[PDB]
């Protein structure tokens, strides 16, 4: 996250980090005890992945961390239908052993298609992660979060030569300086509805980070909520 601030322990208890070929390469959010929702571009078919919930400072030990292995990975069926576009940039991770929910390990709420979209339209959400705090800069040790306003589609569309589909949305500031960035992918874009946070987006991609005239592009969760609930059903 560029131009954000340190979260306090437990401020975003649904946030998790993903470790693998690279440590802390992406973020993700807790759907329930056994499932994490993240970005598909973070989990190429093959490689082994680990999830750490209740994570705050990547180089320290808070004794709130819960490490789990990923036994199943489900990227959206349409991701990579069209080469190098990032449309449908969402994936689901199933954990080998359930997480123990507590103040530092709590699911994010997921409304239905209609309400997720209404919550997004409130126009202000938070993004978080351990990604770069500077374009091409260092990764963060302490979880970062940043408030970002929703961007009108026409402005979004004109900010880049790349395609922005209806499964995406823009968020960021016209003046730049603040944005999610590399390493933040899979992490959540969340909207607070009277104290209760809802998953409204998934950190997906962008052109460089925090540059004036550019915005963060997010996967629009409203379009995938039925898919998420269907696949993450607890038995």
């Amino acid at each position: 996250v560029v131009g954000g601030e340190d979260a306090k322990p437990g401020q975003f208890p649904w946030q998790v980090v993903l470790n693998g070929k690279v440590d802390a390469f992406c973020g993700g959010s807790i759907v329930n005890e056994k499932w994490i929702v993240t970005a598909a571009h973070c989990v190429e078919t093959g490689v082994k992945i680990t999830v750490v919930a209740g994570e705050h400072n990547i180089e320290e030990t808070e004794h709130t961390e819960q490490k789990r292995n990923v036994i199943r990975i489900i990227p959206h069926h349409n991701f990579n239908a069209a080469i190098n576009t990032y449309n449908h940039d969402i994936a689901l991770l199933e954990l080998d052993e359930p997480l123990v929910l507590n103040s530092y390990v709590t699911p994010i709420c997921i409304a239905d298609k209609e309400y997720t979209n209404i919550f997004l339209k409130f126009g202000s959400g938070y993004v978080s992660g351990w990604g770069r705090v500077f374009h091409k800069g260092r990764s963060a040790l302490v979880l970062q979060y940043l408030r970002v306003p929703l961007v009108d589609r026409a402005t979004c569309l004109r900010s880049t030569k790349f395609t922005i589909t209806n499964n995406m949305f823009c968020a960021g500031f016209h003046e730049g300086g603040r944005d999610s960035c590399q390493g933040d992918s899979g992490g959540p874009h969340v909207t607070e509805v009277e104290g209760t946070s809802f998953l409204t987006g998934i950190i997906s991609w962008g052109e460089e980070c925090a540059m004036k005239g550019k915005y963060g592009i997010y996967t629009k969760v409203s379009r995938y909520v039925n898919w998420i609930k269907e696949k993450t059903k607890l038995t």
Partner: protein, 59 residues
């Protein structure tokens, strides 16, 4: 109706008969006694901070 302020529903609102309103909440919560607000029905309901952060208040 749900038209204004989500029909006073803290979480979800659905339009019923005679311009009436039927509220609801997301998993882990329960529609209070006043059929409006949402209350924790489990130890750790989704989307809520329970750490309170820091340590300096009346509590």
């Amino acid at each position: 109706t749900c038209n204004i302020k989500n029909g006073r529903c803290e979480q979800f609102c659905k339009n019923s008969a005679d311009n009436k309103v039927v509220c609801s909440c997301t998993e882990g919560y329960r529609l209070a006694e006043n059929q409006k607000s949402c209350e924790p029905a489990v130890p750790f309901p989704c989307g809520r901070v329970s750490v309170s952060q820091t340590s300096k208040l009346t509590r």
